Fold Outer surface protein A.
Amino acid sequence: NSVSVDLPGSMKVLVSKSSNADGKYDLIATVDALELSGTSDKNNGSGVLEGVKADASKVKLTISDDLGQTTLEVFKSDGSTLVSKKVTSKDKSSTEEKFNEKGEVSEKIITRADGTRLEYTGIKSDGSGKAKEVLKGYVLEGTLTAEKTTLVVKEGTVTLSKNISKSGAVSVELNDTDSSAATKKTAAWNSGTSTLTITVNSKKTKDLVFTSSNTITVQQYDSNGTSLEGSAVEITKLDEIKNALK
């Protein structure tokens, strides 16, 4: 009689076809090998299910009213302290958190809808930690603070820094310790187009575009330093970012 309902996060819940004397619906789900069960006052598969792991950890699956979001939580055996939390949001991005013995977040993995990831590890009580962005073809490494994520690529005397602010806004900067005006790279960030323009000797050399698709493209300027030439090329590997900083 039960109705199978498809959930975000590659899960399924079975909901009773009819409500009980309280007006409520029974919910059953199998997550990995774990059986979870619950009761809901909605008929569509939303609500709360609970179970226990073989090691007595408590498990809770919460499904939002519109089935847009799921939260899968694991707790200590008394149910008081979080051990892990995975939220799949309505855009199908996910956040996976682990918690120290006190239940403070110690690790957070964000998986975007396109599969690229922000990996935050060794998170401390001030929200600082290590950071890695996992892109298609390459990874960017850096640090996390409560103000921003800073991912760094070095090439020669040039340091490229991609910042992701606490609000999610991106800015990019370039620093070059080359003190010679003939060769030193400088760069300007255009927040409107998410483009870093690199200049050498008062002429633009290339545009690095940080796309909404979580890719980077590079396009050269003509020797005149004012017009772009050719067409932008998508970076596929870390060596190509380094080449763009030469």
